[PDB]
Design an enzyme around this catalytic site. Structure first.
Site, PDB file in Angstrom:
ATOM      1  N   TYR A 106       0.914  -1.223   0.017  1.00  0.00           N
ATOM      2  CA  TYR A 106      -0.166  -0.017   0.002  1.00  0.00           C
ATOM      3  C   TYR A 106       1.015   1.199  -0.193  1.00  0.00           C
ATOM      4  O   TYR A 106       1.548   1.622   0.886  1.00  0.00           O
ATOM      5  CB  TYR A 106      -0.912  -0.009   1.395  1.00  0.00           C
ATOM      6  N   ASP A 145      -2.042  -1.120  -4.095  1.00  0.00           N
ATOM      7  CA  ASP A 145      -2.449   0.337  -4.452  1.00  0.00           C
ATOM      8  C   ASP A 145      -1.387   1.226  -4.579  1.00  0.00           C
ATOM      9  O   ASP A 145      -0.595   1.415  -3.485  1.00  0.00           O
ATOM     10  CB  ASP A 145      -3.560   1.041  -3.347  1.00  0.00           C
TER      11      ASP A 145
END
Ligand code: MN
Ligand code: MN
Length: 251
Positions: A106, A145
């Site tokens: 992330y 992400d």
């Protein structure tokens, strides 16, 4: 073949009330990675039957956090990138499998007005070095992400977003440099000309219904893995977060 899934769930407890487990059970992934759990493993009440689950939680409560669920037992698991400065926010899990490492990440958001851009640049420098160090032993698959849209095709309003987090020249350049270091953007490997393929939609009115979004979720792989790839997926219809899941199939 094997099917790998990645999903920024915008809070696992929230996403569970919006059907997370339904998609988890339905897609039956060999490895399923999530970002923004926003919770501690100790407080997990959910059952992921048939999977090993590995958690990385931030020091700050209700912030960030990633989890990797895998059917196969890894040969090893590490957490973070072995740098105390960058390992406080529950952002990276690396599972070693027989023929590749799977890095679940992330990436730090650069924040409104790019206030955290300088830290993000330092993150990108070290993350790339971390990946190359892994490659000394085995090829690498990265998923998560990454908080960057690469080219104009990758978001709906490119020319008005170049000062927004995720589409600054600085962030785009680091992602280019990451690929130039030997990595493939798998979705664009299979679908270089596909427009309107997005994985995130803002809370602007009806943004998602109108598909006004950005592509900021990825699977990357080391160049030598190219010949094993079968397909790259965007699960645009799965609700429950401001991101949708992405996937990779390979043999
Ligand atoms: Mn979020
Ligand atoms: Mn054993």
């Amino acid at each position: 073949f094997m099917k790998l899934i990645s999903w920024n769930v915008n809070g696992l407890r929230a996403c569970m009330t919006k059907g997370f487990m339904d998609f988890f059970n339905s897609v039956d992934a060999d490895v399923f990675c999530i970002q923004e759990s926003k919770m501690q493993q100790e407080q997990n009440t959910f059952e992921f039957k048939g999977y090993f689950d590995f958690w990385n939680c931030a020091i700050k409560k209700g912030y960030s956090g990633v989890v990797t669920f895998t059917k196969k037992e890894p040969l090893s698991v590490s957490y973070g990138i072995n740098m105390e400065e960058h390992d406080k926010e529950g952002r990276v899990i690396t599972c070693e499998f027989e023929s590749f490492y799977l890095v679940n990440v992330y990436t730090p958001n650069s924040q409104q007005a790019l206030s955290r851009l300088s830290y993000r640049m330092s993150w990108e420098v070290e993350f790339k070095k971390f990946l190359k160090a892994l490659e000394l032993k085995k090829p690498v698959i990265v998923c998560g992400d990454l908080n960057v849209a690469h080219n104009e095709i990758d978001l709906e309003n490119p020319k008005t977003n170049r000062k927004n987090a995720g589409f600054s020249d600085e962030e785009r350049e680091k992602f280019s440099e990451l690929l130039n270091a030997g990595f493939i953007d798998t979705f664009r490997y299979f679908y270089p000309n596909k427009e309107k393929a997005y994985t995130w939609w803002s809370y602007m009115q009806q943004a998602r219904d109108k598909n006004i979004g950005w592509r900021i979720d990825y699977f990357l792989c080391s160049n030598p893995l190219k010949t094993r790839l079968k397909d790259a997926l965007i699960y645009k219809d799965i609700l429950g977060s401001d991101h949708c899941p992405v996937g990779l199939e390979l043999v």
